[PDB]
């Protein structure tokens, strides 16, 4: 059961050198080549790292890759981090020939100062009990870079019943707004005592608690 | 100019078999490998089955019981067959070039455009509009977020307005989310100032053209 994983986001300003990781789980990545694909939004995948250290014709040589067999991780390196590098980065490994991929990596160029997100939470309204429905509302906005992960809680315990996270879109002020929603039932709303929503923005996370 | 195309039906039902085929341009299959790769929604690509000119195949262990890839060397194509399609099978399917040796592809230069396959059996439905009330307290920042929640509709799209467009300060529409049961959901909120809260009217007007659903809901601070 070999699988690939990619970091959700990395923050780095242009002019620096940035790295992107991809670590195997069950097996060894030393048994197959790694191939890295770049996916600018609205475009098909195209290779950037090729046979673990080569690049195809036309790609600048600054796209460097490597294989680390110590912890079974692969690295995508961009030396001259450019504002035109914004794309989706994927890694390749073969599991008896499987063209498996990771979760995806969003690398953004910092042209704006780091923004601490503000999170507002809304428990299901009273008009939802009569409809035999329940759903926690978790709104996050005004943060950059716009890529966070969300984990629901049920009486201080992980739950993944209805996790529905869609991409943050562009705002008016160049910022981004997150999305993550927990679909539920009225019996489950009153069943517990503490509901919360968290977002791991970069390295620090802000959470609030709502109770029925 | 090596080129590739895929084709097939864009809508599939549960418990059905899924059939595809990719065509090659400007070459042969003799020592030229081909893979069928898919993009699950919001996830990375993964592959199911390969073939060469003779007909030997390698399969995905997870989809082994549901994969059949065959070559048609006379007309120069290769076909994807996916039996017993489930909700987890939603993706867009890609055929890619392959050069290699002894079963492992050592070269993937060009990629197909990809064809869209939908796996659902959900009928068209009207949204269930849900207003959401904030804590109605002057928080750390003097911002009051009021809005309505849209759920259980099919298919896209839906746009949410505010006071017939009169309010525009805190209006922020979103893309929709996917409920696993076959329906969708949306979100809308207004970030009104805390001082101007409690007495002013906040109403959202929802539009679902496929279901012809127009619902007006009023949002209140607290009760």
Q: How far apart are CA A145 and CA A157, in angstroms?
A: 28
Calpha distance B180→B127 (Å, rounded): 16
Q: What are phi and psi of B65, to 5 degrees?
A: -70, -10
Helix runs in A26-78, H state only: none
Whether B133 and chain A come into contact, CB under 8 Å, resolves to yes
Token look-up 């906040």 returns B202
Give this entry's resolution in angstroms: 4.3
Q: Which two tokens stand for residue A44?
A: 């098909």
Q: From CA A122, how far away is CA B200, in angstroms rounded?
A: 20
In eight-state DSSP terms, residue B159 is E
Nearest residue in B to A181, CA atom: B177
- Name residue, tokens 């989706």: A88
Q: Which residues contact A158 (CB under 8 A, 6 or more apart)?
A: A151, A152
**Given the structure tokens 């492992």, which residue do they identify?**
B104
Number of residues assigned to chain A:
212
By the CB < 8 Å criterion, does A100 face chain B?
Answer: yes
- Residues forming a β-bridge with B208: B158, B213
Q: How far is A43 from chain B (nearest CA, A)?
A: 9
What does residue B89 show for φ and ψ, rounded to 5 degrees? Answer: -90, 0
Experimental method used, please? Answer: cryo-EM
Alpha carbons B33 and B28: distance in angstroms, whole number:
10
What distance in Å separates residue A86's CA from the closest CA in chain B? 17
Picking from B105, B53, B104, B47, the residue whose alpha carbon sits closest to that of residue B76 is B53
Query: Closest Cα of chain B to A210: distance in Å?
Result: 10
Instruction: With beta carbons less than 8 A apart as the criterion, state whether A170 and A177 touch.
Output: no
CB A158 within 8 A of CB A17: no
Cβ-contact B38, B94 below 8 angstroms: yes
CA dihedral sign of residues A152, A157, A162, A163 = positive
Q: What is the CA radius of gyration of chain A?
A: 20
Cα dihedral B130→B131→B133→B134 (10° resolution): 80
- Whole-number Å distance between alpha carbons of B120 and A176: 31
Q: Mention every residue, 6+ apart, whose C-beta is less than 8 A from residue A2.
A: A24, A25, A26, A27, A93, A95, A98, A100
Whether residues B179 and A162 touch (CB distance < 8 A) is answered with yes
Measured distance CA(B152)–CA(B127) in Å, rounded:
5
């Amino acid at each position: 059961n070999f699988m690939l994983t990619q970091p959700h986001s990395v923050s780095e300003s242009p002019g620096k050198t940035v790295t992107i990781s991809c670590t195997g789980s069950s097996g060894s990545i030393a048994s197959n080549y790694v191939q890295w694909y770049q996916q600018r939004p609205g475009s098909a995948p195209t290779t950037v790292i090729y046979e673990d250290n080569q690049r195809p014709s036309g790609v600048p040589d600054r796209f460097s890759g490597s294989i680390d067999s110590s912890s079974n991780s692969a690295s995508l390196t961009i030396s001259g981090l450019r504002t035109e590098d914004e794309a989706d980065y994927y890694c390749q490994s073969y599991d008896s020939g499987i063209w498996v991929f990771g979760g995806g990596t969003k690398l953004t160029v910092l042209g704006q100062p780091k923004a601490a997100p503000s999170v507002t939470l809304f428990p299901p309204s009273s008009e939802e009990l009569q409809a035999n429905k329940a759903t926690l509302v978790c709104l996050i906005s005004d943060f950059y870079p716009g890529a966070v992960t969300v984990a629901w809680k049920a009486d201080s315990s992980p739950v993944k019943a209805g996790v529905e996270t869609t991409t943050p879109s562009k705002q008016s002020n160049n910022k981004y707004a997150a999305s993550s929603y927990l679909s539920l039932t009225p019996e489950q709303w009153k069943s517990h005592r503490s509901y919360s929503c968290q977002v791991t923005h970069e390295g620090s996370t802000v959470e609030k608690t709502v109770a029925p | 100019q090596v080129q590739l195309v895929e084709w097939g039906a864009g809508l599939l039902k549960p418990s059905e078999t899924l059939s595809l085929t990719c065509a090659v341009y400007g070459g042969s299959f003799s020592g030229y490998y081909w893979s069928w790769i898919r993009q699950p929604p919001g996830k990375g690509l993964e592959w199911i089955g390969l073939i060469n000119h003779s007909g030997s195949t390698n399969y995905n262990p997870s989809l082994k019981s549901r994969v059949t890839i065959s070559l048609d060397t006379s007309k120069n194509q290769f076909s994807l067959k996916l039996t017993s399609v489930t909700a987890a099978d939603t993706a867009v399917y890609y055929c890619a070039r392959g050069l290699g040796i002894f079963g492992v592809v050592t070269l993937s230069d060009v990629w197909g455009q990809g064809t869209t396959v939908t796996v659902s059996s959900a009928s068209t439905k009207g949204p269930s509009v849900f207003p959401l009330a904030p804590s109605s307290k002057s928080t750390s920042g003097g911002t009051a977020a009021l809005g309505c929640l849209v759920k259980d509709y099919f298919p896209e799209p839906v746009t949410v307005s505010w006071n017939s467009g009169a309010l525009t300060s805190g209006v922020h529409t979103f893309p929709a989310v996917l409920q696993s049961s076959g329906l969708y959901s949306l979100s809308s909120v207004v970030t009104v100032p805390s001082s101007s809260l409690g007495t002013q009217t906040y109403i959202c007007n929802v539009n679902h053209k496929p279901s012809n659903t127009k619902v007006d809901k009023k949002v209140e601070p607290k009760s």
